[PDB]
Design a protein around this ligand. Structure first.
Ligand SMILES: [Zn+2]
Ligand SMILES: [Zn+2]
Ligand SMILES: [Zn+2]
Ligand SMILES: [Zn+2]
Lengths: 274, 274, 274, 274
């Protein structure tokens, strides 16, 4: 068997974190990324697992995740470095049969631990599993520059923020018809911010943390990365437009309605009504 | 002989899509690219073709393209990934003898299909073939960031937009003397927007889709990429200038006239008249 | 024994300088970087040392640095070229037993000398050694674009500047709770600016040189680079926000206090009091 | 003997053009670069020369360049492509004994010719040879984005423009104490614009072409690239500052005078007097 570092999921984690680094979204240890796998993905690589996997409790019981393996970024690790030493910067964890904690099956070497935003990640996976009938498998957080800047100048309201982001690139309503949930500012690395994010994830695939960054959910690494890249691209356009004095013209409600009809998506009602 | 992946046209498609990705013009699956080939280009590579080429109808009859091969980007495919798996992200199609449809001779694996903007592409090829006596061979669409931003702040008028872009870098009048056609906002992925784009291509090598992006035409991948890159560079300069309060001075009509005379190009009259 | 160019410390210097070059922080010979080593790091590579190591006096006696080796960037050398020829662009120097000067043991070929900001570097090492009980080992200077821009539009005051940078990305208060010291503009390459920077390093891990750039200190190359990248990322966000007409909402004092208490850090009092 | 493509000068031309491409300064065929060589540089590589070197006249006699070889970028060639095929995109030319014309000894394949800005280049080399006692060997033109943007908003005046660029990064007065000469807009690719540039090069190492770009001169590729990168970095800072409402504070005349004193340079009097 090829080494686990050559697997699609390890290579995918390297590509996504490295790409995010090059985008300027992941200074220092900013950002974190978790991908839900199946047993069948990791089973063939069992020979590469730790001889005595470390056990760490979860922040709270998560029985929906019982027996579920994930590949995750490590706490304090730099996205820039993942490509240089995957086992030091990433790991595979498997939640136990009670959903009480997990074993570190591979990686997170040298006493590394999973991201300190694990509550936000795993609680959000739970809500997205329920919301998408098990389709979504990735939660990604990064410090997307223009989205962050917009949280200082736009009303921090789901409808307003969704509507502006839809306007800032035509594809946006098709890529995120459910819109972008916006939380109040909250203290990072807490179960509060984690659960608040998970609750927003019931209704949206994107959640903004004002003055901080973004969370996205999707079925694959590429589709989740691309979801965030789309919102951030729209944000980039908007920052330019606002810097030039604002919109002289823009995508109208009628045009958004026609767009939704053509692509068979139902646009978030509150954002459309503006 | 050598694999078709090493051919000039597959390598060229990889270079253009990868470069556009690095420019930040092609988030997610944004953008599409088609290059018209000759039979002689692809004939040596017949052993790399699909054993049983799939047939797909065109959106409408295109008899001018009868028997014509193209290399195209696939629908939903990411420009970022083309370099990683050319056959998964690109395909070679050959239009049948009636211009009714095409066979997928190579690539577009796992049941992929050509870009959903194929009407805009192939109808534009038809009009550019007629306009340039068969010299043009490429249609490129991307989400050129600054060009998109300008569509929210400048009058969406061909004369006005052309004139500002000529002003934003001296070379522009020489690179696109016919100017930049601007459509109204339209629903993507329709034959209406495809047909409207092709009409504009009768008179211009560049066409803007407000709040969305750009289409360019040219004889080679590099010339078409360079055409868009030139307009987008000018847009980048303009966004900076407008953000700094606007033009204190600029390229004058007299200077544009002298420039056109020196390089033997006839500047779009409506843009010059402003 | 492998060549010293393959050592962890030469490779680390290459990574940091190359990464900073890619960030746009190190045009021409802008920036300088020094890393304090142990004798045991360089001892195995003694065969690579110059046959007759050149002696250069220090600008002033630095007895705390007696017998201490450093790897340093050379004066006038381009960060862009470090990866191409480490020995031409970097050097290993060892301070003599009375802290009066150093020998150039390796590199700085063709009569190159250490950075002309050596006083700023070595005097800051001395103060950081005292301040951190020997934990800090790196001093990094670069021309961080957005931090530079902010020095023309924000009050050049430690409290004000620190508070804005904390506001521009949530993590900042946790990454630099001691804040950012701001000096007046001073003539580069002098012991005055070096000594002034070192004094500020008694109280902060980041120091700004108005209309010029930044200095950072940390235990490792990555930690120091990451410190600067965090401050510069916040600056980038702030430049966008200010360009869009300023902060409509932002991180509050209350929130900053809550953040400090969650992460067990004491925020700089003066910046918190604003 | 190795292929001439592996020579220091071909490799140098690849590095400079590729780096300028990555900076966003050389869309399409924007920019041009010429490096003066010695006979001894190219003599070893005669087997790589063309069977029958093409002769092309110079635009006017340049006796100072009699018998002088250069490596040059080709007309209409893309900086982006120089790394992919040096011979297609670059050429080695040797000026004849009269200074009346040159032979294309290597490269510029498929009937390519030297840059259409050859008058600006070769006339500028002549003036810089005289101005520097033969030290300068490189003339570089590129479309430096922020410098271009500033020409729409700052007075296009040597003193004013020099003074702002000095203010926008502390090092600038030391890197270009003679300042930046600003021409009026002129028609590209003419001996008029070429000689006007060469005359400005008598007094300055940087010359600006409003609404177009920059020319720089220096002893080596790196020093000339670095000169331009420094001015463009300052321009980048200024564009941010001006976009944020302008300078609240800046480098003073007193400070510029002190800087010039320290580094033994004589600042351009007109720029200092402002
Ligand atoms: Zn975060
Ligand atoms: Zn599109
Ligand atoms: Zn400096
Ligand atoms: Zn030019």
């Amino acid at each position: 068997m090829q080494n686990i570092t050559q697997s699609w999921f390890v290579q995918g984690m390297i590509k996504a974190t490295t790409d995010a680094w090059l985008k300027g979204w992941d200074e220092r240890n900013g950002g974190n990324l978790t991908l839900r796998l199946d047993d069948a993905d990791i089973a063939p690589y069992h020979d590469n697992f730790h001889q005595q996997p470390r056990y760490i409790p979860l922040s709270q019981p998560m029985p929906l995740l019982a027996n579920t393996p994930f590949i995750v970024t490590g706490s304090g690790k730099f996205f820039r470095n993942v490509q240089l030493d995957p086992a030091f910067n990433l790991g595979i964890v498997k939640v136990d049969s009670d959903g009480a904690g997990y074993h570190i099956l591979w990686g997170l070497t040298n006493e590394a631990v999973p991201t300190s935003e694990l509550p936000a990640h795993f609680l959000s996976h739970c809500e997205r599993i329920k919301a998408t009938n098990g389709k979504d498998r990735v939660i990604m957080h990064c410090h997307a520059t223009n989205l962050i800047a917009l949280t200082y100048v736009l009303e921090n309201d789901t409808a307003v923020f969704t509507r502006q982001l839809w306007e800032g690139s035509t594809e946006c309503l098709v890529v995120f018809p459910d819109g972008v949930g916006i939380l109040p500012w909250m203290v990072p690395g807490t179960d509060a911010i984690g659960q608040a994010t998970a609750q927003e994830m019931q209704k949206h695939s994107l959640v903004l943390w004002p003055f901080h960054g973004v969370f996205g959910s999707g079925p694959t690494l590429d589709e989740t990365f691309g979801l965030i890249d789309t919102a951030e691209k729209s944000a980039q356009v908007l920052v330019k437009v606002y810097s030039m004095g604002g919109m002289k013209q823009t995508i109208s409600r009628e045009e958004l309605i026609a767009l939704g009809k053509r692509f068979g998506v139902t646009p978030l009602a509150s954002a459309l009504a503006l």
